[PDB]
Design a protein around this ligand. Structure first.
Ligand SMILES: CCCCCc1ccc(C(=O)N(Cc2ccc(-c3ccc(CC(=O)OC)cc3)cc2)C2CCN(Cc3ncc[nH]3)CC2)cc1
Ligand SMILES: CCCCCc1ccc(C(=O)N(Cc2ccc(-c3ccc(CC(=O)OC)cc3)cc2)C2CCN(Cc3ncc[nH]3)CC2)cc1
Length: 329
């Protein structure tokens, strides 16, 4: 069915990764594929932090297609800095390749201990140009410009732990991934893949909420006050001194998220946002939900949402398409 298909590997129902190469010698890396960011971040052989010592590292000297840039990049994570500089080289994603401007990372310390604790080497952003450092056209946009695909879109069919594999597909929408109707939502900004949906959980509602479709976030995030209200009183317990909520897995009081527009209706039932934690208690689950406030009222529709719904990210039409993901592949 053509298109460029990059297989996705689940890690513990907490993240997924895909592989891609840098350099015309095809130096291999494992990446977070993140619609919530917009640069390609690749750890350098010149990075000698503790974290880098555990990773696959990029050596520009070994690629004939390396084009030096050297423009310095500094990014703040939560309370630390990540630094490096721009480089241009051949980036291979699936069966497609192109010269591309990425950030060669020298200091990863601001991303600790997350970086060392995880098995990925880098992060490949899939957001919009304006979200990027350095105003870099997204990979898929650049592929289209070069007539390597006919449509500047990509799709996510997420892997499901203990059930099936997943795919990032560039260039077209394949029937094998979804069932029922695909419905489209226009972007409210060309920044994140952010759309406007009415959010309702039980009797709590936020009309025309900003909803960010975000493959790099493993939870659903909800405004803090909204979350407080929806969680009363459901036999859910905040874990003392931790930002986590736990509950019995068969808890019949647990609500379903409802997100609606004039174009479609999307729901997220407890089975999709509950994570079994049998090791901490028989029949106990954690809620894959985090309270988070943004300057405008925002939900992040992260991996729990994307596991249920196949998603289409269309640069040409400035829209997100959503359909029920096929249960098996
Ligand atoms: C050599 C590699 C250098 C990489 C440098 C770098 C670049 C970008 C970020 C960043 O900030 N991100 C991207 C990000 C994406 C995913 C993760 C991540 C990491 C690990 C795990 C699994 C885990 O639980 O480990 C304990 C799950 C997710 C971490 C960060 C965030 C982008 C914004 N979203 C949240 C968001 N905000 C608005 C919309 N969505 C969260 C991830 C962090 C570091
Ligand atoms: C209900 C929660 C339990 C479900 C499991 C789970 C696992 C991983 C995650 C996850 O997407 N990340 C990546 C991430 C998610 C969100 C952010 C983020 C970044 C910035 C902001 C600030 C803001 O408000 O935006 C402007 C708010 C949030 C940054 C990174 C996490 C990666 C791991 N680190 C913690 C860690 N453990 C070990 C090392 N680091 C936290 C973020 C979320 C949930």
């Amino acid at each position: 069915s053509s298109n460029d298909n990059i297989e996705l590997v689940d890690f513990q129902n907490i993240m997924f990764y895909g592989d891609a190469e840098v350099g015309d010698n095809q130096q291999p890396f494992t990446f977070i594929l993140d619609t919530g960011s917009a640069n390609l971040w690749v750890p350098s052989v010149k990075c000698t932090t503790a974290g880098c010592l555990t990773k696959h590292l990029y050596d520009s000297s070994k690629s004939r297609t390396y084009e030096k840039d050297g423009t310095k990049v500094e990014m703040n994570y939560v309370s630390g800095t990540v630094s490096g500089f721009f480089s241009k080289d051949l980036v291979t994603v699936g069966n497609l390749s192109l010269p591309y401007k990425f950030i060669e990372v020298i200091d990863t310390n601001g991303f600790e201990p997350t970086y060392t604790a995880s098995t990925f080497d880098g992060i490949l952003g899939l957001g919009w140009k304006d979200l990027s450092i350095g105003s870099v056209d997204p990979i898929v946009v650049e592929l289209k410009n070069q007539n390597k695909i006919e449509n500047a879109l990509f799709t996510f069919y997420l892997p499901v732990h203990d059930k099936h594999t997943g795919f990032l597909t560039i260039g077209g929408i394949e029937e094998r991934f979804y069932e029922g109707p695909l419905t489209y939502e226009k972007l409210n900004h060309d920044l994140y893949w952010q759309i406007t949906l009415d959010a309702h959980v039980g009797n709590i509602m936020l009309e025309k909420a900003n909803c960010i479709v975000d493959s790099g976030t493993s939870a659903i995030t909800v405004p803090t006050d909204f979350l407080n209200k929806m969680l009363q009183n459901l036999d859910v317990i905040k874990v003392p001194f931790l930002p986590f909520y736990v509950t019995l897995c068969n808890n019949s009081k647990l609500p379903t998220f409802e997100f609606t527009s004039e174009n479609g209706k999307y729901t997220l039932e407890p089975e999709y946002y509950l994570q079994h934690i049998e090791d901490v208690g028989p029949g106990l689950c954690m809620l894959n939900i985090i309270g988070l406030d943004f300057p405008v009222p925002t939900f992040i529709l992260g991996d729990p949402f994307m596991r249920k719904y196949f998603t289409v990210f269309d640069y040409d039409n400035h829209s997100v398409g959503i359909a029920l993901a096929k249960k098996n592949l």
